[PDB]
Amino acid sequence: GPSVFIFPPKIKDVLMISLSPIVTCVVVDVSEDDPDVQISWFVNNVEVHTAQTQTHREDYNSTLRVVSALPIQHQDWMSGKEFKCKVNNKDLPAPIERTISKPKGSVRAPQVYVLPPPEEEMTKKQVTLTCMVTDFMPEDIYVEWTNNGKTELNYKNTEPVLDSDGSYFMYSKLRVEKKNWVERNSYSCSVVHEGLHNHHTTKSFSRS
């Protein structure tokens, strides 16, 4: 029966010195008859014993789901270490292993632009600011908005798109009260990407 998926940490948890990047193995289709699952973790084939393995959550299908989260070192992800989880369970005719690492690839920092609202919107209750982030490799990226350091609630990012020169782009949209976009006020799109000096850039503007 059971199946295993492995997931990378968030690029922002890796780049930001104070955050904690985690690699995750998820075992699904664990039968309720045979709930016990043993999960072993390895970094460059060196076994480690630090994973939080969460009380095998229950699922609809009437199956169990096992989530094991290995906290890792920032340096280990970016240096290309291999993270491997090994999964044992009675119903497995033999252990399942999954491996993941950060792939080599070119690194290209994104260009970041903020676009003001379109003209016709200028007379609506809310307006919409757009952050356009283009030209970046690899595709892992984090984008958010603020206004004088207060991080904004109401923005949504698209997922990245493989552009035609093989780089990635994405857009981030922020809805704000028209009132704001006029009087004083500052809005900033912050982007975190490994190609950017000190990992981050923010682009700003307001009322023209």
Partner 1 sequence: HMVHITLDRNTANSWLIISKDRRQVRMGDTHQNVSDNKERFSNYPMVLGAQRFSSGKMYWEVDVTQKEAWDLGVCRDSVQRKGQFSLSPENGFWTIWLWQKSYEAGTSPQTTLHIQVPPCQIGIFVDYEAGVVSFYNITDHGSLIYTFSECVFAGPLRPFFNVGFNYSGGNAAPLKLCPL
Ligand X SMILES: *[C@@H]1O[C@H](CO)[C@@H](O[C@@H]2O[C@H](CO)[C@@H](O[C@@H]3O[C@H](CO[C@H]4O[C@H](CO)[C@@H](O)[C@H](O)[C@@H]4O[C@@H]4O[C@H](CO)[C@@H](O[C@@H]5O[C@H](CO)[C@H](O)[C@H](O)[C@H]5O)[C@H](O)[C@H]4NC(C)=O)[C@@H](O)[C@H](O)[C@@H]3O)[C@H](O)[C@H]2NC(C)=O)[C@H](O)[C@H]1NC(C)=O
**CB of residue 59 vs ligand X: minimum separation in angstroms?**
5
**CB of residue 110 vs a copy of itself: minimum separation in angstroms?**
13
| Block residue for tokens 């699922």 | 59
CA dihedral 117, 121, 122, 127 (to 10 degrees): -60
Q: Could you give the CA distance from residue 199 to residue 191 in angstroms, rounded to a whole number?
A: 8
Q: Could you give the CA distance from residue 6 to residue 139 in angstroms, rounded to a whole number?
A: 18
173 binds, among partner 1, a copy of itself, ligand X, none (CB under 5 to 8 A by kind): a copy of itself
Residues that bind partner 1 (CB under 8 A): 14-18, 73-75, 77-79, 107, 149, 190, 195, 197-202
65 binds, among partner 1, a copy of itself, ligand X, none (CB under 5 to 8 A by kind): ligand X
Q: Are 14 and 4 in contact (CB under 8 A)?
A: no
Q: Could you give the CA distance from residue 22 to residue 50 in angstroms, rounded to a whole number?
A: 11
Residue 76 CB neighbour total at 10 angstroms: 18
**β partners of residue 100:** 83
Which of 33, 120 has the CB closer to ligand X? 33
Q: At residue 39, what is the residue type?
A: I
**CB of residue 29 vs ligand X: minimum separation in angstroms?**
5
Per-residue binding letters, 106-145, with a copy of itself (x by CB under 8 A): -------xxx--x-xx------x-x-x-x-----------
142 binds, among partner 1, ligand X, a copy of itself, none (CB under 5 to 8 A by kind): none
Residue 180 main-chain phi, psi, to 5 deg: -65, -55
Which of 72, 174 has the CB closer to a copy of itself? 174
Q: Could you give the CA distance from residue 20 to residue 185 in angstroms, rounded to a whole number?
A: 33
Binding stretches for a copy of itself (CB under 8 A): 113-115, 118, 120-121, 128, 130, 132, 134, 154, 156-159, 161-164, 169-171, 173, 175
